[PDB]
Write a protein that binds this ligand. Structure first.
Ligand SMILES: CCCCCCCCCCCCCCCCCC(=O)OC[C@H](COP(=O)([O-])OCC(O)COP(=O)([O-])OC[C@@H](COC(=O)CCCCCCCCCCCCCCCCC)OC(=O)CCCCCCCCCCCCCCCCC)OC(=O)CCCCCCCCCCCCCCCCC
Ligand SMILES: COC1=C(OC)C(=O)C(C/C=C(\C)CC/C=C(\C)CC/C=C(\C)CC/C=C(\C)CC/C=C(/C)CC/C=C(\C)CC/C=C(\C)CC/C=C(\C)CC/C=C(\C)CCC=C(C)C)=C(C)C1=O
Ligand SMILES: CCCCCCCCCCCCCCCCCC(=O)OC[C@H](COP(=O)([O-])OCC[N+](C)(C)C)OC(=O)CCCCCCCCCCCCCCCCC
Ligand SMILES: CCCCCCCCCCCCCCCCCC(=O)OC[C@H](COP(=O)([O-])OCC[N+](C)(C)C)OC(=O)CCCCCCCCCCCCCCCCC
Ligand SMILES: CCCCCCCCCCCCCCCCCC(=O)OC[C@H](COP(=O)([O-])OCC[N+](C)(C)C)OC(=O)CCCCCCCCCCCCCCCCC
Ligand SMILES: CCCCCCCCCCCCCCCCCC(=O)OC[C@H](COP(=O)(O)OCCN)OC(=O)CCCCCCCCCCCCCCCCC
Ligand SMILES: CCCCCCCCCCCCCCCCCC(=O)OC[C@H](COP(=O)(O)OCCN)OC(=O)CCCCCCCCCCCCCCCCC
Ligand SMILES: CCCCCCCCCCCCCCCCCC(=O)OC[C@H](COP(=O)(O)OCCN)OC(=O)CCCCCCCCCCCCCCCCC
Ligand SMILES: CCCCCCCCCCCCCCCCCC(=O)OC[C@H](COP(=O)(O)OCCN)OC(=O)CCCCCCCCCCCCCCCCC
Ligand SMILES: CCCCCCCCCCCCCCCCCC(=O)OC[C@H](COP(=O)(O)OCCN)OC(=O)CCCCCCCCCCCCCCCCC
Ligand SMILES: CCCCCCCCCC(=O)OC[C@H](COP(=O)(O)OCCC(C)C)OC(=O)CCCCCCC
Ligand SMILES: CCCCCCCCCCCC
Lengths: 70, 66, 100, 315, 341, 96, 174, 117, 116
């Protein structure tokens, strides 16, 4: 009886779960980071300018191997 | 007399008036608690502020514990 | 600034409406102009504060700076139309985005 | 800005649009199944396997039936209004708080209010341009409805914003890490449920499309595609305010499947109110959203102003 | 004012908005004060039992809203070019500010709304329109040092407000055209001395405020209503009609004094030609003042027979006769005054 | 040139709005809509002035409030036309 | 490029607005005009607040004006003209061509955005609409806000006085 | 905001393609004389819907416009609490909401929130 | 504006080695950096406030960059892999790189700093 409501609801539960989780794959295919950089604050935008100035990929991180030995 | 008529016909207005009076009392308590201590001199300051030792704003700087 | 005619307590709210004192780069210049506008007056300040008025005017209005920039931009396109400036080297090297 | 971003923002927005449209279709299926089960009867069961391809039956038929070319109407304004209704009802869904950076909506409440005001503009344009008396009456009922609920919807939103301190809805997630806001805001859980039904033109406030007071409301001259885009616009608005009930009152997390289970539950609540309560009059709607909801919103705004000053001194 | 306390509230917000306008050290504060004054003066001047009062309110609304939007436009342009609140050298945006102020004040050639709207009013709202609503645009004209545009406005106002008042036999439009003619004397004093303008405005508002009370109490909306107006002694009507010779500038009445101080301050400041142009203007104003004065100077009239007793308010007629004494024998207070030194 | 390249456009659009306000139209509500358009262009010019200055854009809401109260005054005048006339024709009103 | 496109669209919609007799044509034209004006105003400020505020204002205003359209001048004829369509299309394509062949550094606005401000500005690193809207609630200009509350109350009293509710509903030939 | 413009144009484009696909795949039957007529519940109309409509809530609409521009001045003070004087902020905020309550309760007392009738 | 009368530092002065670390690498170990560069940062920002001239405090900027470089050399010599893991966790864990999203690798990095 009442369980037949659950077909037709889980599809609303699954498909609306699609456009988040798919980007949690679709960033990792090409960005390499699952979270692309947020631009709410001015300082995060300025440091994003700094990353995109240092490398063409702002999500590629410059570690301590960049620093020369002295 | 008029409180029973207002509490019978428009009870949401009476409940909202009680909530607004409680909010006015809590605003008075919050302002008095803010200005009882040194509320204008906040512990964490926005921006990067540096004071010299001879500055009059230097001795007002708090030294509390986080 | 203007003057209050037949000034009352009602001008105290109005007087602080628009001014450059609130976190602006120009306001100190404006303050200096207001200083002689308190000293010389509104009428002697039009003649004896010609240096302080013009500095504030091309500081917040940016008239001379923008005329300079539009003369720098028009001369480059004029040299490109006349043929002195090559199309490959038409623009100079760009600044870093971390600059300014 | 990095090139890949633009591409992934476009891809995520298009995937969101497609998933909201298919979820609108299955929301029609969900309403037609549980709304039957609100009564004794069943939902759609015969077509397809167990009624699952029934919205596909409803979409194949409405995309093939004859387009109405009405006589006394302004057809050049009658053809364009359901397109703009679906456009704003899908354009409002870009305001969704993603934990990835879909769009950096710092002013999401103002964007929501702008698209909320624009959807009823499409409704009242479609009501006038049909050149029918029932269509004009449904359009004027929609205008009276939005004039009733608009300032009430704004002030109630401000009270929630005060608990946040910012207009960014992802900041709803950090302030709900210990508990949901249904504990604090239960009277505006009722009030925001009342407003959200007036936002989506749903029962008890269904004066823009009345089946007994008027004849189909402003949809009386719309058929075979215009009615389809109007209907998907209405149900995408229902999905959006179900999502906003889950954002403000419940957990704002999006990496849990419990959020989408809660969104399906709030959509079931939206069907559930329609299947229980009778419709109002819009006289009583205007006397409700101006003398009760607005007064309670201002009063509890005063309560939150005092509580936020009390909390700020303690921090 | 009459029949409601909300009209007293509207008068209070009227005074508040006008005093916000004239005290502003920025054009934006003056503009928002004009918005407050317009908000206050729309509900007075509106009456649903009068079909023409709503049309007069609409004419006032359209004229003031057009003039306030041009005033804000040229104010924003003045802030855009010369970034302070004023201008060092005079330019065209100061002329646009002055023109938008002249549309508010009602001076020629932007005068056309003013007597066409005054037919729809009562007398008290007419007195509020042509006295207090000329405080805020005329005091804002004082900040602008423009001579040719103000001189053109002065010449056009004194020519038109004298010539135009000859045709109308209705007292409201005639008194509106008189207020246009007295506006030119105010604007001529505005570029020599602000104090002399204040004195001419105060005495003009005094003579307006005593001539309104004779028309408000007895409801004299036409010229032949003066001839049919019943008085219990014809010497009383002879004395009450001397205020028109006062407003015409005839000595030894009180209204010779503000015109005389304007003429003295104009000749000290070496203006002679436009002063002579304003001599020929005020003869025509005195000429259409004398058609009112026909109703009391012949001492005996073929009057209507049915009316036998005249009726008046207590406090209004008590306050009227204080000022009628000072509008006739007001030159004996020439020694008391100390503003003019 | 500098006045031509910057902010010369909303002067032209304000002049076009003023010509739309004073054009011979049959109804008063078209003049109310032209008033809304000149509010929009005054907002544009005031917004240019308040955005040359850094943190003085708070004034831009006050102009909105005085303009909305102007529009409410015009709408209430349009209601008060129905109390005396049966119409909003500008030809139907008294020319004197 | 987008700013010059908004310039061209605002010019074309202003030509359309000056030529429309019917109130609903004026309403739709000022709808797209306030959309384009809201986007253009946003370009000038560091934050996007006042565009949103102006959009709520100009959608709360014309919502009422349509009810007065349906109550007064509900029946009026639309007249499409080929001359206006050809003029608007030719001027629009001409200004898109002229904006494409223009240097966009010279035609850009000199007003400073949130990223046009320099890094050394510590006031730019705060929350984006804090210091702009601060002076509404600060000590020198709270009294202007007080005056605006009282002004809106007086406005409402004026509206109640000159729209008498007890005289009946309003329509044509009432 | 430039991305929001492009995605709004894309949503408008997609909805126009959807409506044109609904129009193309629709059944194309010949237009009858009385098929196109307005419905009016199955009978002749006697009046067009362009006839003037009576407005019984004009005061409520103008009060809505006044209250909406009052909404436009409340929305700042979420941000302004952390950056201003607390005393001045509370005097302005409680005085704002109390003046709105005086105005709304006064018009409730007069009955001006009831429809004209 | 800049004219010929105003002096400017030469190109040989501004050609020193600069910190070219990314945002996640700067945010990782940010609290340990300022405990070592408290004197240079405060002096440079104090003289940048009042002097308000980029030509002034150039040597203070050199001292700030030299202190940051010396701290990053000291991090690089001892347990570079723990700093790499912390910077990778802070990059990949959230959009805004909040320290609250992963604290285990922060504890491991602080344990290595306290042990070294
Ligand atoms: C200095 C600088 C400034 C100077 C300004 C000077 C110019 C203005 C002066 C105006 C003076 C005046 O009063 O004029 C009135 C005068 C009389 O006006 P009218 O056009 O007769 O009457 C108009 C009706 O009254 C109108 O009455 P109505 O209200 O009933 O009309 C309904 C109205 C209803 O209109 C509306 O509802 C508005 C619709 C707007 C949007 C449309 C989008 C379409 C997208 C596709 O429809 C229209 O207005 C038509 C609009 C058609 C669509 C236009 C599309 C392009 C513009 C798009 C704008 C941006 C929006 C994009 C979409 C955004 C979506 C979010 O105007 C003219 O004469 C127009 C100028 C014509 C000049 C000549 C044109 C070129 C030559 C043509 C003939 C060529 C022959 C070639 C022959 C070749 C073979 C031999
Ligand atoms: C006593 O006197 C009386 C009489 O005398 C005796 C009478 O006789 C009568 C008359 C009465 C009768 C004759 C009978 C009684 C009447 C009733 C009982 C009626 C009451 C019952 C109801 C109203 C039904 C209950 C209500 C329900 C179930 C609500 C739902 C109802 C609907 C109609 C909704 C269905 C509509 C739909 C689904 C619209 C279709 C649109 C879509 C499906 C679009 C969605 C699209 C998708 C899902 C996919 C699209 C995807 C796209 C475009 C993108 C995809 C792209 C990809 C690339 C994949 C009366 C009243 C009377 O009193
Ligand atoms: C979520 C679902 C979204 C929509 C998916 C497509 C439509 C639904 C499935 C197809 C229609 C129903 C199945 C059907 O008719 O099968 C009969 C036909 C076979 O029947 P038949 O037509 O050959 O014979 C009649 C049946 N007898 C023999 C009893 C008389 O099935 C198929 O052809 C198989 C199709 C693919 C099925 C894939 C698995 C589906 C499992 C359930 C999913 C829910
Ligand atoms: C979830 C969203 C789904 C959207 C699409 C839903 C429907 C998709 C499946 C059905 C497609 C039907 C296409 C044809 C529709 C019109 C039918 C019709 O009357 O055709 C008559 C017309 C004309 O044939 P005719 O000669 O009978 O017409 C004379 C006129 N009447 C109808 C009055 C008799 O047929 C065609 O145009 C044939 C088209 C064939 C190809 C159709 C498209 C295929 C790809 C899709
Ligand atoms: C916001 C959402 C709006 C959604 C609906 C948009 C409708 C766009 C219509 C575009 C018409 C363009 C055109 O040329 O129109 C001339 C036409 C002229 O009519 P016509 O019948 O002569 O045109 C037929 C033209 N031929 C012959 C070539 C096919 O007019 C219309 O189409 C009517 C426009 C009505 C506009 C209603 C606006 C309502 C606004 C409400 C709020 C403000 C109050
Ligand atoms: C667009 C939507 C595409 C998917 C839905 C349509 C195709 C499936 C379908 O329903 O086919 C019809 C037929 C079942 O016939 P039906 O009358 O629905 O069954 C009643 C008994 N429960 O089912 C069949 O004949 C089954 C074989 C075809 C299935 C095709 C599925 C993909 C298309
Ligand atoms: C925010 C406010 C914004 C406001 C401005 C908005 C402007 C938007 C653009 C407006 C453009 C207007 C162009 C109008 C052209 C048609 C004019 C018209 O009226 O056509 C009439 C026609 C039939 O109507 P008729 O017979 O006149 O009946 C009325 C009788 N009362 O009507 C019709 O046939 C209906 C229209 C059918 C159009 C079909 C087009 C052909 C197909 C295109 C390609 C589709 C491809 C789909 C698949 C794609 C796959 C990738
Ligand atoms: C300084 C300002 C002094 C006046 C303040 C007035 C405040 C109230 C304004 C208002 O709108 O009051 C409503 C009503 C006034 O009367 P109303 O119904 O508007 O007019 C009918 C006659 N045409 O007023 C009433 O019904 C209340 C009774 C009169 C006012 C008493 C309180 C103010 C006394 C001063
Ligand atoms: C410079 C020299 C200026 C000399 C001015 C002399 C004034 C003498 C005044 C004496 C009384 C004149 C009264 C009179 O004649 O008024 C009527 C007059 C013209 O009447 P009109 O409507 O043109 O009739 C023709 C059709 N029957 O007038 C009217 O009807 C209205 C006024 C129209 C003419 C206005 C003239 C304005 C002159 C401005 C001078 C500005 C000088 C500075 C410019 C910079
Ligand atoms: C600066 C702006 C301009 C000036 C201010 C304008 C607005 C002023 C508003 C307040 C005016 C107060 C003075 C006039 C009072 C008139 C009479 C009145 O309203 O009495 C209060 C009344 C009593 O309750 P009632 O509904 O009569 O209950 C039946 C009991 N037998 O009703 C009530 O108790 C309910 C409503 C009370 C008034 C609103 C809430 C305070
Ligand atoms: C056809 C247009 C329908 C009306 C759209 C109205 C949108 C809200 C009003 C507004 O000005 O919003 C400002 C907002 C400002 O952006 P936000 O501040 O919302 O977000 C920043 C933006 C990438 C950080 C989130 O802009 C828009 O909403 C874009 C509108 C695009 C219109 C395209 C067609 C011209
Ligand atoms: C109605 C006013 C509410 C806010 C009151 C603020 C001041 C409280 C007392 C402070 C004493 C120092």
């Amino acid at each position: 009886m009442w369980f037949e409501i659950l077909p037709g609801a889980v599809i609303i539960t699954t498909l609306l779960s699609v456009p988040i989780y798919a980007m949690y794959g679709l960033d990792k295919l090409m960005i390499g980071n699952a979270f692309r950089r947020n631009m709410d604050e001015r300082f995060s935008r300025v440091m994003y300018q700094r990353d995109f100035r240092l490398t063409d990929n702002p999500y590629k991180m410059n570690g301590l191997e960049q620093i020369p030995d002295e | 007399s008029l409180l029973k008529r207002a509490w019978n016909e428009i009870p949401d207005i009476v409940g909202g008036s009680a909530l607004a009076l409680a909010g006015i009392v809590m605003a008075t308590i919050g302002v008095a608690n803010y200005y009882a201590k040194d509320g204008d001199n906040r512990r964490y300051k926005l921006g990067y502020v540096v004071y010299r030792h001879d500055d009059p704003r230097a001795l007002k700087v708090r030294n509390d514990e986080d | 600034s203007l003057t209050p005619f037949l000034r009352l307590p009602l001008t105290d709210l109005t007087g602080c409406l628009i001014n450059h004192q609130t976190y602006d780069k120009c306001g100190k210049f404006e303050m200096k102009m207001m200083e002689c506008f308190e000293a010389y007056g509104l009428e002697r300040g039009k003649r004896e504060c010609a240096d302080l008025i013009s500095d504030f005017q091309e500081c917040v209005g940016m008239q001379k700076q923008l005329m300079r920039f539009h003369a720098m931009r028009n001369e480059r396109y004029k040299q490109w139309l006349k043929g002195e400036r090559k199309g490959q080297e038409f623009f100079a090297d760009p600044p870093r985005v971390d600059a300014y | 800005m990095f090139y890949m971003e633009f591409i992934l923002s476009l891809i995520g927005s298009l995937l969101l649009i497609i998933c909201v449209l298919v979820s609108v279709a299955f929301l029609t299926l969900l309403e037609r199944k549980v709304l039957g089960y609100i009564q004794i009867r069943k939902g759609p069961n015969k077509v397809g396997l167990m009624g699952i391809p029934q919205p596909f039956c409803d979409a194949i038929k409405l995309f093939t039936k004859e387009q109405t070319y009405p006589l006394l109407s302004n057809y050049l304004s009658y053809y364009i209004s359901p397109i703009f209704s679906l456009f704003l009802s899908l354009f409002v869904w870009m305001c969704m708080p993603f934990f990835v950076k879909l769009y950096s909506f710092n002013l999401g409440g103002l964007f929501f209010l702008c698209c909320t005001s624009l959807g009823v503009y499409t409704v009242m344009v479609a009501g006038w341009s049909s050149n029918s008396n029932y269509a004009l009456l449904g359009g004027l009922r929609a205008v009276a409805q939005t004039i009733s609920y608009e300032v009430s919807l704004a002030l109630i939103l401000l009270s929630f914003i005060f608990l946040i301190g910012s207009y960014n809805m992802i900041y709803f997630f950090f302030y709900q890490v210990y508990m949901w806001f249904l504990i604090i805001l239960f009277p505006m859980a009722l009030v925001w449920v009342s407003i959200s039904l007036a936002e989506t033109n749903r029962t008890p406030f269904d004066f823009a499309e009345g089946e007994s007071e008027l004849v189909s409301g402003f949809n009386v001259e719309y058929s075979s595609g215009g009615f389809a885009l109007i209907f998907m616009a209405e149900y995408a608005s229902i999905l959006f305010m179900s999502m906003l009930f889950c954002v403000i009152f419940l957990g704002c997390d999006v990496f849990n499947l419990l959020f989408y289970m809660k969104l399906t539950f709030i959509s079931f609540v939206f069907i559930w109110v329609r299947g229980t309560l009778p419709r109002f009059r819009y006289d009583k709607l205007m006397y409700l959203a101006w003398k009760c909801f607005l007064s309670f919103s201002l009063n509890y705004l005063l309560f939150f102003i005092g509580f936020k000053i009390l909390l700020f001194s303690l921090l | 004012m009459f029949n409601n306390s909300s009209k007293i509230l509207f008068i209070t917000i009227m005074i508040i908005g006008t005093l916000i306008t004239v005290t502003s050290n920025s054009w934006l504060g003056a503009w928002m004060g004009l918005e407050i004054n317009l908000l206050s003066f729309i509900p007075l001047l509106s009456d649903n039992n009068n079909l023409m009062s709503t049309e007069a309110s609409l004419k006032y609304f359209l004229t003031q809203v057009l003039a306030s939007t041009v005033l804000l436009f040229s104010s924003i342009l003045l802030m855009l070019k010369n970034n302070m609140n004023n201008e060092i050298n005079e330019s065209f945006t100061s002329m646009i500010i002055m023109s938008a102020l002249l549309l508010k004040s009602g001076a020629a050639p932007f005068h056309f709304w003013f007597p066409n709207m005054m037919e729809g009013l009562t007398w008290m709202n007419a007195l509020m329109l042509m006295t207090w609503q000329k405080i805020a645009p005329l005091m804002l004209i004082s900040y602008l040092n423009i001579k040719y545009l103000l001189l053109i406005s002065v010449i056009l106002s004194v020519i038109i407000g004298a010539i135009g008042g000859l045709n109308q036999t209705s007292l409201r439009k005639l008194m509106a055209f008189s207020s246009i003619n007295h506006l030119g004397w105010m604007l001529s004093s505005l570029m020599i001395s602000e104090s002399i303008w204040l004195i001419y405005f105060f005495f003009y508002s005094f003579l307006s405020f005593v001539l309104t009370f004779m028309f408000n109490i007895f409801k004299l909306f036409h010229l032949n209503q003066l001839f049919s107006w019943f008085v219990n002694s014809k010497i009383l009507k002879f004395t009450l009609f001397m205020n028109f010779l006062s407003l015409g500038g005839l000595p030894p009445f009180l209204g010779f004094l503000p015109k005389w101080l304007v003429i003295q301050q104009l000749t000290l400041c070496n203006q002679y030609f436009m002063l002579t142009l304003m001599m020929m203007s005020t003869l025509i104003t005195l000429f259409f003042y004398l058609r009112i004065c026909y109703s009391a100077f012949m001492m005996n009239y073929f009057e209507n027979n049915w009316i036998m007793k005249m009726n008046m308010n207590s406090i209004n007629y008590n306050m009227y006769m204080i000022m009628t004494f000072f509008s006739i024998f007001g030159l004996f207070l020439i020694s008391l005054f100390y503003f003019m030194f | 040139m500098i006045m031509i390249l910057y902010w010369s456009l909303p002067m032209i659009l304000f002049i076009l709005g003023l010509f739309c306000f004073v054009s011979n139209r049959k109804h008063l509500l078209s003049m109310l809509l032209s008033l809304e358009f000149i509010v929009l262009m005054l907002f544009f010019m005031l917004f240019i002035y308040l955005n040359m200055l850094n943190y003085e854009s708070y004034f831009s809401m006050m102009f909105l409030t005085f303009s909305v109260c102007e529009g409410a005054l015009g709408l209430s005048i349009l209601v008060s036309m129905i109390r005396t006339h049966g119409n909003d024709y500008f030809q139907s009103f008294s020319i004197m | 490029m987008i700013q010059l496109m908004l310039y061209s669209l605002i010019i074309t919609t202003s030509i359309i607005f000056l030529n429309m007799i019917h109130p609903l044509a004026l309403g739709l034209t000022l709808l797209i005009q306030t959309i384009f004006v809201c986007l253009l105003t946003g370009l000038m400020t560091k934050s996007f607040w006042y565009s949103y505020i102006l959009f709520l204002i100009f959608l709360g205003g014309m919502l009422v004006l349509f009810i007065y359209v349906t109550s007064l001048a509900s029946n009026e004829m639309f007249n499409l003209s080929m001359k206006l369509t050809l003029f608007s299309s030719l001027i629009l394509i001409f200004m898109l061509i002229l904006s494409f062949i223009m240097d966009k550094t010279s035609s850009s606005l000199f007003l400073m955005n949130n990223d046009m401000q320099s890094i050394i500005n510590m006031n730019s690193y705060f929350m984006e609409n804090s210091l702009s809207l601060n002076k509404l609630y600060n000590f020198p200009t709270n009294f202007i806000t007080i005056l605006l509350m009282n002004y809106l109350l007086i406005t409402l009293i004026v509206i109640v006085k000159i729209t008498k509710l007890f005289k009946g509903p309003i329509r044509m030939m009432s | 905001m430039f991305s929001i413009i492009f995605i709004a144009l894309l949503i408008l484009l997609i909805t126009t393609i959807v409506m044109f696909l609904a129009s193309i795949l629709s059944k194309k039957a010949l237009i009858d004389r009385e098929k196109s007529s307005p419905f009016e519940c199955g009978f002749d109309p006697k009046s067009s819907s362009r006839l003037p409509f009576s407005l019984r809530f004009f005061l409520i609409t103008i009060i809505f416009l006044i209250f909406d521009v009052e909404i436009a001045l409340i929305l700042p003070m979420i941000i302004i609490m952390k950056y201003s004087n607390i005393m001045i902020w509370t005097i302005t905020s409680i005085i704002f909401i109390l003046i709105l309550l005086i105005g709304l309760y006064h018009e409730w007392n007069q009955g001006m929130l009831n429809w004209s009738n | 504006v800049i004219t010929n009368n105003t002096t400017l530092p030469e190109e040989s002065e501004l050609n020193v080695q600069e910190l070219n670390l990314s945002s996640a690498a700067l945010r990782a170990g940010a609290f340990h950096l300022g405990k070592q560069c408290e004197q240079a940062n405060n002096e440079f920002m104090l003289c940048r406030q009042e002097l308000d001239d980029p030509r002034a405090c150039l040597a203070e900027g050199k001292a700030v960059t030299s202190c940051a470089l010396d701290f990053f050399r000291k991090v690089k010599k001892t347990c570079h892999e723990e700093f790499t893991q912390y910077a990778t966790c802070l990059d990949k864990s959230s959009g805004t790189m909040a320290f609250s999203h992963c604290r285990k690798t922060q504890g491991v990095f602080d344990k290595c700093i306290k042990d070294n």
